[PDB]
Design a protein around this ligand. Structure first.
Ligand SMILES: [Mg+2]
Ligand SMILES: [Mg+2]
Ligand SMILES: [Mg+2]
Ligand SMILES: [Mg+2]
Ligand SMILES: [Mg+2]
Ligand SMILES: [Mg+2]
Ligand SMILES: [Mg+2]
Ligand SMILES: [Mg+2]
Ligand SMILES: [Mg+2]
Ligand SMILES: [Mg+2]
Ligand SMILES: [Mg+2]
Ligand SMILES: [Mg+2]
Ligand SMILES: [Mg+2]
Ligand SMILES: [Mg+2]
Ligand SMILES: [Mg+2]
Ligand SMILES: [Mg+2]
Ligand SMILES: [Mg+2]
Ligand SMILES: [Mg+2]
Ligand SMILES: [Mg+2]
Ligand SMILES: [Mg+2]
Ligand SMILES: [Mg+2]
Ligand SMILES: [Mg+2]
Ligand SMILES: [Mg+2]
Ligand SMILES: [Mg+2]
Ligand SMILES: [Mg+2]
Ligand SMILES: [Mg+2]
Ligand SMILES: [Mg+2]
Ligand SMILES: [Mg+2]
Ligand SMILES: [Mg+2]
Ligand SMILES: [Mg+2]
Ligand SMILES: [Mg+2]
Lengths: 157, 115, 236
RNA sequence: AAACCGGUUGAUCCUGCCGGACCCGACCGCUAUCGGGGUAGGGCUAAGCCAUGCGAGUCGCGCGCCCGGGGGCGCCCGGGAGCGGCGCACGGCUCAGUAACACGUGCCUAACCUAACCUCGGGAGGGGGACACCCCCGGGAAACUGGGGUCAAUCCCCCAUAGGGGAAGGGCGCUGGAAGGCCCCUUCCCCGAAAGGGCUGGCGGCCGAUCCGCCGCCAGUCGCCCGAGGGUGGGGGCACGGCCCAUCAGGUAGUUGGCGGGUUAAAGGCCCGCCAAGCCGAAGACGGGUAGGGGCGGUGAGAGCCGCGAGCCCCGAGAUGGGCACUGAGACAAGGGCCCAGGCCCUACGGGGUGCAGCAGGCGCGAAUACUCCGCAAUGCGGGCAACCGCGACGGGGCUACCCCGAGUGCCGGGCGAAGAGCCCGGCUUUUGCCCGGUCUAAAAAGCCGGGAGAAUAAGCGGGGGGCAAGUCUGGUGUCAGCCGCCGCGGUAAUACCAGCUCCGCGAGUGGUCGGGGUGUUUACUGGGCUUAAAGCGCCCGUAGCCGGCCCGGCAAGUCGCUCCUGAAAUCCCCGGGCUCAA
């Protein structure tokens, strides 16, 4: 009798106790460093990180034979996205990943880190107003997670 | 400004036509007119413009590039019997408008009769 | 009668979500509804000759498409296993052969082969005058004299001449012949019939085919003999 | 993230309940700029009552007639009112009934029917009739409907043959696991086909402009009838699976079974005549209550719990209540029929029609709700050789804090301000909002490309005593007014009330009340407890159930391994790809 409807994807990143002073301080630090719009963006990044880490945990829990046809492609995809720098690291090192690696892949973050903008908020304004070209096309979403191959194809108008 | 190219061309002998997909590159410029696409295709293929019909011109997000779906017909009679009336109205100019008006009149008749 | 897209057969080469809520329902013809594809679906989604149902129905109504030697002008005509499809204005000839990936695919075949159909015998009946009616896998019938009907058994194959209405050849179900799986999971596999477990019900007997070292198992109902070590008709 | 926190004491360890924090669903308050994706919206409330409009047609290549234009061969084109064929039993709605072979999974019909379609074999000969539209007259308020005349058919009927059924006897033979079946032979009784019709082209003949046909042959083509199989739909049967209550323990009498029949398309206490006493039940009958079943959905780390088991797909049932039939392959038929009940509308009083649980829409109820909009262009279906036609299905937009996704409400430097808000100064940008063009769209709207001016058009909701992030700052009140999920404040110096200032949390959302899950090891299989905190029946005998010594041999039921046929699709997990990423 149940009809499926979409659910929020940042729930896995959102904490259940928001009123911790330490958690609030670290989240505020991350938000101010990367110029995020609200806590939903940070929790979405944490949800992405949680997916990656739980995939690593699941592949670790599978046997060697089952893990064999999935371990190498998994690390290859993480390397291609840019979350992991060495695609041949052991699987258990993937368990220790950090949300800052995912936050670095934002288009606004990359525009700031390439020196194309005066500040991270100015990079967000550039991406919003449409002056950032990704391989010729305007990508107007500041939260876009740029891959490694597309990282070098970022231009300004 | 407007760089056109035949991206692909399939040949449907069953419907007596050729389905061409054309790439249009227009940087910093408006979407090309379907009349302009038809004129370029007619000049490129050496055929009359009446034998060429445009289905849809779709422009990419964030860049002045457009892909156009075009039908070229061996004869106008089969072209007008195969292509939809709204397509003929879009492409032919006024004769498609006349066809659509006559269809609307013939539909108003028999609906009055059904009343 | 309507066919909801959800109730359409799962192997059909159509999207399951993007599109309308309806699918073209095959019109009770010479196959099974769940093991056949309508002619309009073949023209629009399998050959891509028509972009809409209107254009597909126009193409069919002109008589450009021929199925098993007969022009078919009905857009809901069922098309099924081993059927010969012929396009008239283009001259292209396909056989609907079992496929590993699409489960049923139109593979081009030679013009000399286009007049033959390998039909699996599905049963026999006694009819008036003492004659024998063979019933094949696609519902086709053939009435024969009793002596020729006596030696043809169920699950055999016959290569049948469509143009002559005759049995060009008979391929009996024996161990060691080449067989193709025409149904479930292990579909499209061609191999040597090398092992049988004869259950009490003959149709549910366990059969094993071999392709070198590639051993697959099915039931006896799900295989069709296509000759000895070389298949008689081009299936791949 | 497999999480704890506050509260019973003078203090302490327990038990144990209640609250906090999270997600989801419903309703509600304050507030609200844009875009994308999606099968959101009188379900959770009366299956309550309804004005109005629309919601199943198509076919001239079945048939005659009439009308208008054209032309000479034998008609061409268009239209009209009809007969006739096919369809309307699909599609659309809703959730009363139902605890049931309803539903799901796995199998059957060797006990059955099936128009349309497919294939194989065979057949299409003779004859006859009527009723529409129409013409001449009407009747009636309307609904509806009468008489005479007259042209047809793929309309209706008879005749012949083919074929079919029943009874009985025989057989090599067929299918099949198994013949009560098929085929062959024999006998009698009985029923009993067909449209060579339409079109195209060719040939020949009859006929006449008062005709534009009729006939005989050929080929093509769409058709018609019989037999067999398939296909599709449907009827029926079987094994197993999924609610609560014993403050419901005996129930059943066509009930259980047998025999012989009737009916049915077909088996059956389905029904009937006779015969027997059987059938169900504590492994829970019967009785009551609740409820459509499933795919599935929410929640939790999981076991599990819940049904938000409404929307989407499959099956079921129903069309104001209760019954019964016609036609037809199929209905006992939602926009068809008849009757009772109970309403309502029109009327010329004699009669007629009608029930929105179809798409909009109105009243009512309730805490609680959308346009009397656009199109057959996509997806399909009915009709048609076809072209095409129709479709409130479906598609498209509208409205609405429906769910998910992406963004804006400026950026940079300086000053004042406090490092804040805000203001001012100098520069930059135009997402967005506004105007124009192309593209797009069935057409629109939106989207996308491009062009113009411009900082310019855009932030709220809740809270600051602990839990729990945020003020012992200021004023007012003075156990009053008020706060308060819990603990607790307020009775003159209030961090808790009313206001200011200020800070905190989330943010186009943020809160209130409900229901589910977490919480909860407070339902405990994983995994609780019963000396004293709640909890061992006062004791014992024993039925069902559950649990049961050792060794050897057989089986292989549970169990385990592999494999096959399956468990619809969507949904869920992984991977690749395409929408600017995203959804
Ligand atoms: Mg105390
Ligand atoms: Mg209702
Ligand atoms: Mg016809
Ligand atoms: Mg007419
Ligand atoms: Mg229905
Ligand atoms: Mg007839
Ligand atoms: Mg018989
Ligand atoms: Mg007769
Ligand atoms: Mg006759
Ligand atoms: Mg009987
Ligand atoms: Mg009874
Ligand atoms: Mg838990
Ligand atoms: Mg609905
Ligand atoms: Mg009734
Ligand atoms: Mg009725
Ligand atoms: Mg009603
Ligand atoms: Mg309604
Ligand atoms: Mg249409
Ligand atoms: Mg949002
Ligand atoms: Mg200062
Ligand atoms: Mg527009
Ligand atoms: Mg406030
Ligand atoms: Mg205050
Ligand atoms: Mg605090
Ligand atoms: Mg408080
Ligand atoms: Mg306890
Ligand atoms: Mg006690
Ligand atoms: Mg005791
Ligand atoms: Mg007691
Ligand atoms: Mg006592
Ligand atoms: Mg066993």
């Amino acid at each position: 009798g149940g009809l499926k409807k979409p659910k929020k994807k940042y729930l896995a990143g959102k904490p259940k106790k928001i009123w911790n002073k330490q958690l609030l301080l670290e989240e505020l630090q991350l938000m101010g460093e990367y110029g995020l719009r609200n806590k939903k963006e940070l929790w979405l990044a944490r949800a992405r990180l949680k997916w990656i880490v739980r995939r690593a945990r699941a592949l670790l829990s599978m046997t060697a034979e089952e893990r064999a046809p999935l371990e190498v492609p998994f690390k290859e995809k993480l390397y291609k996205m840019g979350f992991i720098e060495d695609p041949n690291v052991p699987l258990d090192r993937i368990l220790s990943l950090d949300v800052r690696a995912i936050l670095e892949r934002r288009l606004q973050t990359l525009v700031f880190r390439m020196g194309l903008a005066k500040s991270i908020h100015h990079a967000r304004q550039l991406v919003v107003h449409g002056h950032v070209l990704v391989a010729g096309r305007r990508v107007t979403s500041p939260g876009f997670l740029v891959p490694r191959e597309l990282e070098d194809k970022i231009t300004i108008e | 400004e407007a760089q056109f190219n035949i991206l692909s061309l399939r040949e449907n002998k069953l419907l007596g036509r050729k389905e061409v997909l054309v790439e249009i590159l227009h940087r910093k410029s408006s979407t090309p007119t379907r009349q302009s696409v038809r004129e370029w295709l007619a000049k490129q293929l050496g055929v009359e413009v009446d034998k060429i019909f445009v289905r849809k011109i779709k422009t990419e997000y964030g860049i002045g590039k457009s892909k156009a779906e075009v039908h070229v017909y061996t004869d106008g009679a089969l072209a007008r019997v195969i292509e939809p009336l709204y397509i003929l109205a879009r492409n032919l100019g006024e004769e498609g408008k006349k066809l659509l008006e006559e269809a609307r009149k013939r539909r108003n008749e028999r609906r009055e009769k059904r009343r | 009668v309507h066919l909801r897209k959800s109730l359409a057969p799962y192997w059909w080469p159509i999207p399951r979500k993007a599109g309308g809520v309806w699918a073209v329902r095959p019109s009770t013809g010479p196959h099974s509804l769940e093991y056949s594809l309508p002619l309009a679906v073949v023209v629009r989604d399998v050959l891509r000759y028509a972009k809409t149902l209107r254009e597909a129905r126009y193409i069919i109504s002109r008589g450009y498409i021929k199925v098993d030697g007969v022009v078919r002008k009905d857009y809901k005509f069922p098309i099924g296993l081993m059927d010969v499809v012929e396009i008239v204005p283009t001259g292209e000839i396909y056989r609907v052969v079992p496929d590993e990936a699409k489960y049923y695919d139109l593979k081009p075949i030679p013009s000399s082969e286009a007049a033959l159909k390998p039909l699996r015998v599905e049963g026999k009946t006694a009819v008036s005058g003492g004659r024998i009616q063979l019933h094949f896998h696609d519902g086709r019938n053939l009435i024969l004299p009793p002596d020729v009907g006596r030696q043809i058994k169920t699950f055999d194959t016959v290569v049948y001449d469509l143009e002559n209405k005759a049995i060009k050849t008979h391929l009996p179900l024996r161990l060691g012949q080449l067989a193709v799986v025409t149904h479930g999971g292990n579909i499209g596999f061609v191999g040597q019939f090398f092992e049988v477990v004869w259950t009490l019900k003959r149709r549910q007997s366990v059969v094993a085919l071999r392709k070198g070292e590639e051993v697959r198992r099915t039931i006896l109902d799900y295989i069709m003999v296509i000759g000895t070590e070389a298949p008689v008709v081009k299936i791949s």
